[PDB]
Amino acid sequence: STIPSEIINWTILNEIISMDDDDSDFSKGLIIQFIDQAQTTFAQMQRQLDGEKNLTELDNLGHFLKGSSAALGLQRIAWVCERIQNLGRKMEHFFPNKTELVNTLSDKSIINGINIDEDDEEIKIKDENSIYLILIAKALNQSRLEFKLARIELSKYYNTNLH
């Protein structure tokens, strides 16, 4: 879908970076804070898919990660979280396949050598909500991929391997 083609919204990130002048490890410090939050919420979302299967929970978790990511200019992660929310509210009723989404990327050189299904959890989910939980579970595996690309991409600029 209309996922943004650029991994990073530089007009937002440049403004965070501007403040690195008086604080050397500032922007990198936010990024590294985000990388831990993201990993934690992905696991909390995965715990719900496999357990309570509460669509309000997956809405709130999608809400949290959408604010964090959107703040650092990580706009493809934010878009997927927005879908996780709308899917949990049954206001949207489908989610694209990985290939369709990966194909919108401004520069696909960033997926050289990596296996776009590396980080997938098997979707083991029958109920009226069953289809929304399956599509959230698809959106999460796309979120994990977008997370990784965000890390690879930020490494170019922070001169360290951010994953």
Curated annotation (Swiss-Prot):
The keyword Phosphoprotein applies. The modification Phosphohistidine is found at H63. It is found in: Cytoplasm; Nucleus. CDD domains: HPT. One of its GO terms (molecular function) is transferase activity, transferring phosphorus-containing groups. Keywords: Cytoplasm, Nucleus, Phosphoprotein, Two-component regulatory system. GO terms for biological process: osmosensory signaling via phosphorelay pathway; phosphorelay signal transduction system. The phosphorelay mechanism involves the sequential transfer of a phosphate group from 'His-576' (H1) to 'Asp-1144' (D1) of SLN1, then to His-63 (H2) of YPD1 and finally to 'Asp-554' (D2) of SSK1 or 'Asp-427' (D2) of SKN7. Residues 23-125 form the HPt domain. Changing G73C: In NH1; causes resistance to the antifungal antibiotic pradimicin. Disulfide bonds: none annotated. One of its GO terms (cellular component) is nucleus. Its main location: cytoplasm. Changing H63Q: Loss of function. Interacts with the response regulatory domains of SLN1 and SSK1. Phosphorelay intermediate protein that is part of the branched SLN1-YPD1-SKN7/SSK1 two-component regulatory system, which controls activity of the HOG1 pathway and gene expression in response to changes in the osmolarity of the extracellular environment. Catalyzes the phosphoryl group transfer from the membrane-bound osmosensing histidine kinase SLN1 to two distinct response regulator proteins, SSK1 in the cytoplasm, and transcription factor SKN7 in the nucleus. Belongs to the YPD1 family. Present with 6330 molecules/cell in log phase SD medium. This is Phosphorelay intermediate protein YPD1. It comes from Saccharomyces cerevisiae (strain ATCC 204508 / S288c) (Baker's yeast).
